[PDB]
Every structure is written in structure tokens, then in C-alpha cells.
Design a protein around this ligand. Structure first.
Ligand SMILES: Nc1ncnc2c1ncn2[C@@H]1O[C@H](COP(=O)(O)OP(=O)(O)OP(O)(O)=S)[C@@H](O)[C@H]1O
Ligand SMILES: Nc1ncnc2c1ncn2[C@@H]1O[C@H](COP(=O)(O)OP(=O)(O)OP(O)(O)=S)[C@@H](O)[C@H]1O
Ligand SMILES: Nc1ncnc2c1ncn2[C@@H]1O[C@H](COP(=O)(O)OP(=O)(O)O)[C@@H](O)[C@H]1O
Ligand SMILES: Nc1ncnc2c1ncn2[C@@H]1O[C@H](COP(=O)(O)OP(=O)(O)O)[C@@H](O)[C@H]1O
Lengths: 562, 548, 114
């Protein structure tokens, strides 16, 4: 009468059909049975990563016992699931939990050997001391109670393996996570409870899509379970849409929609509307960056190839290095791409390369080994890419860092791997890598290539894609970048109703000035600021110019005036 | 028929009408419904700050249920809140056994709602929850989630986090104007409609401890409350709100309005109230800082990057303190770093930090660590002229983009601070030799990026006595425990002014000189005799010293 | 003095029942006042046989306890707080204390003849 106010009954719960149809995993049930049906020390433990099917094995064993499919000395054994938390709840006295547990042990050993036990998460068996979880060590290595267990591979060696006299009485049954085909089989077996929990239909195509997708993009969970979340969420969403709100089944597009909305990745099959933007992508990107027509095409073809379904699935989506003269638009093109792809400017993870002149400064983007000052923090780059695994990474001006930092990303490129202090790997498999430089800076297409081959080693150039050479700035289209800067200033002048009437000779002079041939278009921003913003703030603070004054500008031969 | 003796109800209490409206925030309700109508992980927990509207959300779900909008899957249901004060040993656990067994024997639509579950999470609910005969609509704080329900749980893998954010001023005013009829049974007045928007926009700006939906209730629900004592004038208003907001925040009711022109054109001799003289520098700095409040320049730049040099002990630092406490409402809002030891390359990184694992890392960089917190400070650079030529490269991209990266990897925001490069070179020539020394010792490109490079000047003996009077007043604040004053003489003031000038340091020795003679001599006086409370204590000048 | 002598297995129960019924006899007249009402949490072997009588509002039961102690004995069970109304008391200031002492400096003069 003790192991019924402190225990459920899995066997009697299986007869009512209130369990799930465990599919597959025959070797594990066989080993559990052959370890549970020996003479002495017949206690198995199911070890494995979280969510790989540890309890489902015991549920399947219960169903097998109910159905009569076990060896001869396993018939009608009525496996029992204790809960050690409901025995340590009310006890504030000397010797209370001891009695509460001795009653259960005596009621187990009083009957014959048909009370097979099951303590889920038995890493909680070492507590309640004050001599607790230690009274069963006599009955363990005697074949009195069977004690089918299950615990995480990490919580095992943290709580149990410090009790080497207690972990001797347990046989470890390793449970690894299944493969994609096994997950598809499991889902096919389980695609009947959701179709009746929700009033919808589910397709084998959707099941296969979930099993294949969740393995490639959700890269921090295991795969009997990370694939059922997608099916359940898609069914719930489609039901909430179909009913009570002012193609009646889930398909291989809703799973991709869930995987895209959650964890922020454009994974899917290129629905309508995106294709239009991807065709009109080079012409659009060329609106913020002028010229460099030979380098926009490659970057655009990278993304088009990636989202078209033709690219190496385990490798970065692009590893372009482009270099050339100063002030030509390398980082500007990088920022333009980051803006066109995410509609936000801070989404890109930009790190400089002027601070890495010293060898020891690499620990900033890796981390620190165990036992050092900053170790629980981690690494800047690793943490920045663990979340938001879709940004672009700009290694700005990677020529100042001396040749020891290159070797770190030598395996970021070509594999998409990087580890930190804790030993966890992060994947740069769907991020566009970009690293600029200024090496060469004056030569032709054969003098700068010699500089590259002399400053880098052959095992580093071999990793990355096209080495783009940015061409100079053509004296004709210089007015257009001036129009770009003026439109930016006008957009800034939006909190008021101010407009501008810049004249053509004023534009000509603003383009000719601040365009040093050795510094490209660097001083143009500061020149526009000096010649417009200071005077406009003066005329706005000193009265005599209010809002809405669409005021023009002139040449004023020496200096630009109002 | 077994738990009503011990718990509340939010479903039967919904048919009565004791619940308030549910107006607004209709996305979170649908999210909670679709999360709760699942097969796994089918119990959400609301994650938000206190006073944002979690209980409002759940009671609104109940009020929608009572009329019928949810699907039939959760129609004809009932919800109950858990009274956590009933448990908090021997009672936190026995009563828990009792209520969980009650829910077990309910066996159905008894959907629960536990407030502050981060105190309950511990494992005895797992064998009952995994079986699936109870649902748990939770509510807690984000920071208490990462602490308990991420480690102490072992059940985190069956909890969905529905995020709740504080509303904006517009929907806050919406809730306010929705909840105005029920304020005619507890208080009776004619509440004005402008009072609500005023209270909202005022509570938003200065009140920081609380959050929007409930923060607007310690308001006018207080104004309609403290207008009751006048029945032992029936229109509340922005004045009847400001009178309590000012008394709350302790700031006098002057800044109630006009935060864009007042406290901006008011940048006047109230600065001079703190610094005596230097009107040219005051006006130049005021004009330069008010030019940046227009909105025409690029937003990625410091608020003011000017500097100034000349002689010391004139008020360089004092002008900085005055600007700080005027523009940022705090006097202890400076970061005085001293550029006298940065004369080596192996000492440059001491102000930016060190990588994760070397000597000075947890101490952080000496410059960025003071800006990561309170990014509304002025940053003084003492003795900049003799810093090694590598910190100029840092401050270049500092005053070029309001961004900088410390050793940790964080990014700091400089675009709303005020830089000051104090220097002492020159100070002998009138105006030209100091400019020559500047042009010789500084990179002329840096000064082009700098703002005004105005110069300080010496102090006049007539206004120098004003500072002596300021110090005398500071001292007079202290000897009030004996109720004494000082009958101060003009020869005495001028004697103090001459004996505290030392034109290599400025007005440094005043705090010591004025203190020593007066304080110690009159202390010996009070201790021996010949002076009592309420006396006048006249002070004049002896042949050399100043006898009392 | 209600639990002073009571050992015959029902004495304190019947005694408290009797005194409570005496309180309920005359309605409105008598305003009960228990000081340190946290002591009634146990004291049995009260507290639980006073709640149904308090669900009738007949007794008034003005009380007083310390703030920190209120949330240690009274606020353990929520069936008690449903019938309690807290009235916070603040400490007096310097002027109020001076006034009180001026009002009280006549009893110590007759106690100590000075
Ligand atoms: N072989 C299988 N056949 C059918 N369903 C399975 C199988 N393996 C796992 N599942 C399902 O996949 C999900 C995984 O849940 P569980 O394996 O019970 O979690 P767990 O293994 O106990 O891991 P934790 O760490 O204890 S949460 C459940 O919905 C199971 O029903
Ligand atoms: N083709 C272009 N189209 C638009 N803006 C351009 C172009 N080339 C240069 N600019 C402008 O030039 C300024 C600086 O350009 P950057 O890309 O930062 O120079 P850069 O390519 O990084 O060269 P360095 O060696 O790194 S300074 C920005 O204001 C850009 O908008
Ligand atoms: N949409 C809304 N409709 C009606 N009242 C609201 C709304 N949002 C917030 N409130 C009010 O704001 C107050 C917030 O209190 P509460 O939600 O209990 O705090 P907590 O966030 O700690 O649960 C409630 O009293 C509620 O009346
Ligand atoms: N113009 C002034 N207004 C107010 N106080 C002043 C002025 N000039 C000097 N003082 C006083 O003299 C002292 C000068 O010290 P300090 O400000 O550190 O000198 P410096 O600014 O040159 O480093 C300060 O304590 C300040 O109170």
C-alpha cells in the first residue's frame, strides 16, 4: 500500500492506449531485456544526449510487455515508475524519509520479482541526506529490484560518477541519436496523432522536408525531437489560420516557413516575390555603389547561386577578397550588400584589423582556455555568430595584422568551423565572408598579384573565391556619387520640411573639389559637411531661415555660398 | 468543490464584471492561445518586467473566453490563479501536494496561472506535468529565468517563452482613456482628457524605476486621490499632475515644460553662477553645444569635442563641472583621466583594455569602462600635450565615429559625450606664442577635426574676492551647529585673495588657507571660551595675520 | 491565561468556544483586541477555530504586530489575510516628538519630585 501512493503504473497505463507508438530501435530494447533478465546486478541505465529517445525506449518496452512479446521470464511484470520527489516533500524531522522509503522497498521485496522499477532522471538519487539514496546499495547488487533508468550523458558524470561505489551497480546502455531516414520512419509512424489532435492533414512530403531541413539549419539540437517541433508548430499555426479567423493541409512550404521565421534564415524553395528582387538585384545594388561592375556581378551571383539551391551545402556561401586603390568603395559595397540583404545596417559583424598588430591579440575573437581570466565570457566573433547565423563578416583592412592571425580563419574559410574556450564549434556555413585590403595600391593586374603572392602563403589564397581588383574612379560618373551624398543629406533633413536646390555648377565644383586622385572619394563627405551643414546650422540658428525654405546654393567663385 | 476553500478564481469572477477592460495588446493573447493549443510544449510562460500587463493578458484571455472567441478545443474551460502567499518548510510542500492532488482529481479544464514561478522551480511537478493532465500559464522576469529555469529546472525543455514588452506612450494613453469611467466610484471629480496624455508623457521621461502601464497609475489615480482632502476645483490637470511628479522626483517644478528652449537658452550666467569670469569661453562653448542640438550634422560624432588651454587654477576644471551638472543634471558625471603616464607604446592599451586572459582584463580599459555605464558624461584629458603619439590615433576615430571597441569585444557609444583636452603649454604669451606651440606640438590635422581651441586668461583682483566669498559661504554652512556668523572685512578678503594666488597654481591654496586660520582659530576659541552661541565673531586684519 | 490550566483533551477547545460565543452574544458592543496576533498561529497544542467566527464580522478584532513579523506568521496562510486590513504606522518626527514630550513632562515630575 506504499508503492501506490508514491508510484504510477506504466504497464496498466499502456493497456488503455495512453502511450505512443514507439517505432524502431530494436537493438536497445534487446539489450535492455537481456540486461534486465540476468541473475545479479540486472540494473540498466539509458545514457544519451537530451531528446534522443531515452524514455520512449521504456515506453516501447512497456508496450512490448503488455502485448506479450518478451522472453519467458518477463511475462506480466508491471513496470512501476517511482517519483523520488514526492517522498522528500513533507519531511522536517529526524528519520522520516528513511521510513517513507523503507516502506516502499519492503513492499517491493515482499512480492516476488515482478515489480520492475523505473526511476526517470536518476541523477536525483544522491540527495535528501541531512545516508540517503544509499539504502538501496544492498538490494542493488543482489537482483532484488530491476531499476530501469535514464539520464543525460552530462548529468551522469556530474552527479553519479562521483559515487563510484554506486555506479558499479549500473550497466550503461548507450543511446545515440538516429539518422535522417530513421527520423523519417519515426515521423511516418507518428503522423496519426497530430492529424487527429488538429483537424488538418499532413503530407509525407512535409514530413521528409521537416526531417531534412531541421538537420541542416537547427544545428544545436538532436533529431528524434527537433523535427517534430516543426510539424507540431506548423499544424497549430495552420489550424489557427483555418479556423476562427475572418491548401487545407500542411505541406513542404509551411515547415520551411517555420524554419525561416524562427532562427532567421531564408531557407525554403524561393517563393514568389523574392525571385523578382533577385533578378533585379545587380541593378538595385548598383544604385548605392557606382562603378565596380566587375565585382557586383560576382557577389550577386554568389547569393543567387546560394538561394537557387546549387552550392556546396557544407562550406561558406562566399569568401570574396577584393582590394585596390584607396577610397574606391570596398567597405561601401560591403555595407550596401549588408543593407540589401537584411534591410538593416548594424546586422553585419564588422571587425577591424588595425588593432591586431600583436600576436597575443587573437584571444579576443577565440576566447580563453580553461583556468584563465576571461573564460565564461567566450569569444567576440564566436558569440556574435552563434546568434544571428546569417550576417556577413567584414575583415576590414586585413594587411596590418601580422601573419599569425591569418592562420585562425584559414579554417574558417573552406569549412565554416571555429571553436572557443568551451570547445563548442560554431558553423559559418551560411554567412558571406568578406575581407578587404590595400595591398598593391598603384600597380596593374600583375604588380598587385605579386604583392598578394608575397604577403600570403599558397595555402591561404587557395581557400577563397575570386580575387577581385577594384578599378579606379572614372572622371564622368563622379557627379552621381555627389547626388548620392546630397540625397543622404536631404534624407537627414527630414525632421523639418527643409528642401534644397543645388545648382549644376555647384555640383560640378563639389565633385571636382574633394576628389584627390590618390585618396579617391575620401574627403568628399567632410567637404560636403564643411560647405553645407555648418552654414545651414548658422542660418537656422541665427533666424532668417525657417523650415520649408527650399533655399538654393551658388558657386561664389572661391568658396561655396548660399 | 475541493479547492475553492483555499484558492481564487478568474473565470467565475469574469461573469460578474469585477475585471477591468482588456483594451489593446491582442497579439499576445492569440500567441498564448496557439501555444497552449499544442501537443508538446503546450504551456507558455510570459517573460517581461513587472507592471507590464501579464495578469492583464491572462485575465483578458479569460474575459474573451467567457464571451466565446477561442476555438472549441479550449471553449467551456475555466482558469484559476495560484495564490503564492499561501505557501511562503513543511507547508510549501504539504500544501503543494494537496493542491496538485486536487488538480489531479479535477482531471480537466482547471487551467492554472502561477505568478512568479521562479520561486517554485521544483521537480515534483515534472512527473505530473509530463503525463499531461494540467496546463501552466506562467509569468516571471527575464533575469530570474536565466538564473532558475535555465539551471534549477531540468524541465526547461517543456516551456515556451511568450515575450511581453512595455507599450508606447500612444497605447498607454489609450489604456488610460479606456480606464476613466471606473474612476467615478472610488474618486469623484471631472477628470480632464489632457491630464491623461500629460501624465503619460511625463511619467515616461523622468520616472525610471517603474514601467509604462502601471507607472501611469501612481499618477492621476493619485491626483484624484489627493484632491479629496478639500471636502472636509473639480477639474484635474497638467498642473495637478506636475505638482505631484515634482514632489516625487525631488526636482523643483521649473522644468515642467520647455525642455528644448528653456535649459538651452538658459545656458547663461547660471553657468557664471558656478564659474566667475571667463564669459568669452562660456559663450563660445554654449554656442558650440547649442549648435549641435539643431539636427543638421551627421549623428555619428561627439556632442562637443572642443578643448582649451592656458594657465592653471583659473577654472578649467570648474567650467567642466558646471557644464556637467547643468547639461546632465549631475555634478559627479566626469571622467578625469590623466595623460601623463601614456608616454610609451606598452602603456597605450591601458585605456582600451587587454585581451581575454592577460593581466589587466577584468579591470577593463581605463577609458571605455567609464563610458559603457552612464553614456552621458564629459571626459577630461589632463596634460594631453605630453601623451605619446599613439593615443591621438585612438581619439581620431573617437571624434570621427561615435564608436570604439574595448578588449572584451563590446562596442561603446561616444556620440553623446563631451571631450575636453586640457593642456598647460604656453600660458605666458598673450595670444600668439601659445598658438605657435600648439601648431608645433600637435598634428595640424587633429586640430582641424577639433572644435574651438579657445584660450583662458588670468583673474581680476576685483572679482577674485567673489570666489573668496564663495569659500566663506561654504565654511559658513558648517558653523551653524553653534549658530555663529562671520563679520568679514574687505581688507581681510583682499588679504586672503593676495595670499591665495601663487601664479603657478591659481586658486588651489584657498581651500586650505581659508580653512586653517578661521576654522582652527575659532575652534580653539569655542573650546577655551570668549565666544558663545549666536555671536557675531568680527574678523579683521592684524599687522601680518588676520585676528578675530 | 486561557491555556494556563487545560489538559483534559478538550478543555482549551471548549473554553475558547465558550468565550467566543460570549463575544458573539452582545453584538457590536464589545470590540475585541488581541495584541501580537501572530501568536494565535498555533497555541493549540486557536487560529483555525476563530476563522469561521471571523467570517461573520460580528467580532471587530483590532490588532497590532510588527511589519516583519506580519509576513512570517500571519502571511503564511492566505485564508487569514482575506479578512485583514493593514494600516501602516509611521514613526514620529523631531517636532512631533518634542510636542509629545512637552505633553508628557508632568507625570515624571510627580513620580520623581523634581
Ligand atoms: N523511437 C521512437 N518512436 C516514436 N517516437 C519517438 C521515438 N523516439 C523518440 N520519440 C518521440 O520524440 C520525442 C522525444 O521525447 P523523449 O525521448 O521522451 O525525451 P527524453 O528522451 O526523455 O529526453 P529528455 O532529456 O528526458 S527531455 C517524444 O515526443 C517521443 O514520443
Ligand atoms: N563607387 C562608389 N559609389 C558610392 N560611393 C562611393 C564609391 N566609391 C567611394 N564612395 C564613397 O567614398 C567614401 C569612402 O569609401 P570607402 O569604401 O570607405 O573607401 P575604401 O574602399 O574603404 O578605401 P579604403 O582604402 O578602405 S579608405 C564613402 O562616403 C563612399 O560612399
Ligand atoms: N491592455 C490593458 N487593458 C487594461 N488594463 C491594462 C492593460 N495593460 C495594463 N493594464 C493595467 O496595468 C496594470 C499592470 O498590473 P499587473 O499586470 O498586475 O503587473 P504585472 O506586470 O506585475 O502583472 C494592471 O492593473 C492593469 O489594469
Ligand atoms: N572662475 C572660478 N569660478 C569658481 N571657482 C573657481 C574659479 N577659479 C578657481 N576656482 C576655485 O579654485 C580652485 C582651482 O582648482 P582647479 O579647478 O583644480 O584648477 P584647474 O582647473 O586649473 O585644474 C577650484 O577648487 C575652484 O573652486
Amino acid at each position: 500500500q506504499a508503492l501506490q501512493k508514491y508510484s504510477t503504473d506504466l504497464t496498466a497505463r499502456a493497456r488503455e492506449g495512453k502511450l505512443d507508438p514507439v517505432i524502431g530501435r530494436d537493438n536497445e530494447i534487446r539489450r535492455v531485456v537481456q540486461v534486465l533478465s540476468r541473475r545479479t546486478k540486472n540494473n540498466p541505465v539509458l545514457i544519451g544526449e537530451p531528446g534522443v529517445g531515452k524514455t520512449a525506449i521504456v515506453e516501447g518496452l512497456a508496450q512490448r510487455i503488455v502485448a506479450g512479446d518478451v522472453p519467458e521470464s518477463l511475462r506480466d511484470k508491471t513496470i512501476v515508475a517511482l517519483d523520488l520527489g514526492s517522498m522528500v516533500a513533507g519531511s522536517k524531522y529526524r528519520g522520516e524519509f528513511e521510513e517513507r522509503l523503507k516502506a516502499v522497498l519492503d513492499d517491493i521485496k515482499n512480492s516476488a520479482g515482478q515489480i520492475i522499477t523505473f526511476i526517470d532522471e536518476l541523477h536525483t538519487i544522491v540527495g535528501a541526506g541531512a545516508d540517503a539514496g544509499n539504502m538501496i546499495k544492498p538490494m542493488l547488487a543482489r537482483g532484488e529490484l530491476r531499476l530501469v533508468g535514464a539520464t543525460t550523458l552530462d548529468e551522469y558524470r556530474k552527479h553519479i560518477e562521483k559515487d563510484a561505489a554506486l555506479e558499479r551497480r549500473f550497466q550503461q546502455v548507450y543511446v545515440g541519436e538516429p539518422s535522417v531516414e530513421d527520423t523519417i520512419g519515426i515521423l511516418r509512424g507518428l503522423k496519426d496523432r497530430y492529424e487527429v489532435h488538429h483537424g488538418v492533414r499532413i503530407t509525407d512530403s512535409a514530413l521528409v522536408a521537416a526531417a531534412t531541413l531541421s538537420d541542416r539549419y537547427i544545428t544545436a539540437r538532436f533529431l528524434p525531437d527537433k523535427a517534430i517541433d516543426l510539424v507540431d508548430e506548423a499544424a497549430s499555426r495552420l489550424r489557427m489560420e483555418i479556423d476562427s479567423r475572418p491548401k487545407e493541409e500542411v505541406g513542404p512550404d509551411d515547415i520551411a516557413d517555420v524554419v525561416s521565421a524562427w532562427t532567421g534564415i531564408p531557407a525554403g524553395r524561393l517563393l514568389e516575390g523574392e525571385t523578382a528582387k533577385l533578378l533585379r538585384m545587380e541593378d538595385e545594388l548598383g544604385k548605392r555603389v557606382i562603378g565596380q561592375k566587375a565585382a557586383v556581378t560576382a557577389v550577386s551571383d554568389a547569393v543567387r547561386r546560394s538561394r537557387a539551391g546549387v552550392s556546396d551545402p557544407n562550406r561558406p556561401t562566399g569568401a570574396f577578397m577584393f582590394l585596390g586603390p584607396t577610397g574606391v568603395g570596398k567597405t561601401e559595397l560591403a555595407k550596401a550588400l549588408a543593407d540589401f540583404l537584411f534591410d538593416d545596417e548594424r546586422a553585419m559583424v564588422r571587425i577591424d584589423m588595425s588593432e591586431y598588430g600583436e600576436k597575443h591579440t587573437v584571444a579576443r575573437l577565440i576566447g580563453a582556455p580553461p583556468g584563465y581570466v576571461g573564460y565564461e565570457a567566450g569569444g567576440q566573433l564566436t558569440e556574435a555568430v552563434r546568434r544571428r547565423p546569417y550576417t556577413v563578416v567584414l575583415f576590414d583592412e586585413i594587411e596590418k595584422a601580422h601573419p599569425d592571425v591569418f592562420d585562425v580563419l584559414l579554417q574558417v574559410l573552406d569549412e565554416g568551423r571555429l571553436t572557443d574556450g568551451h570547445g563548442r564549434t560554431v558553423d559559418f556555413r551560411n554567412t558571406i565572408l568578406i575581407l578587404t585590403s590595400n595591398l598593391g595600391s598603384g600597380g596593374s593586374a600583375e604588380q598587385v598579384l605579386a604583392a598578394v603572392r608575397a604577403t600570403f602563403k599558397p595555402e591561404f589564397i587557395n581557400r577563397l573565391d575570386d580575387v577581385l581588383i577594384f578599378e579606379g574612379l572614372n572622371p564622368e560618373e563622379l557627379v552621381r556619387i555627389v547626388d548620392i551624398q546630397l540625397a543622404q543629406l536631404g534624407k537627414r533633413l527630414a525632421q523639418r520640411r527643409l528642401q534644397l536646390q543645388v545648382s549644376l555648377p555647384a555640383k560640378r565644383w563639389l565633385a571636382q573639389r574633394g576628389f584627390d586622385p590618390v585618396y579617391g572619394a575620401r574627403p568628399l563627405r567632410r567637404l560636403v559637411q564643411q560647405a553645407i551643414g555648418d552654414q545651414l546650422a548658422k542660418m537656422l540658428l541665427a533666424g532668417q531661415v525657417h523650415d520649408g525654405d527650399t533655399v538654393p546654393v551658388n558657386v561664389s567663385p572661391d568658396a561655396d555660398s548660399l
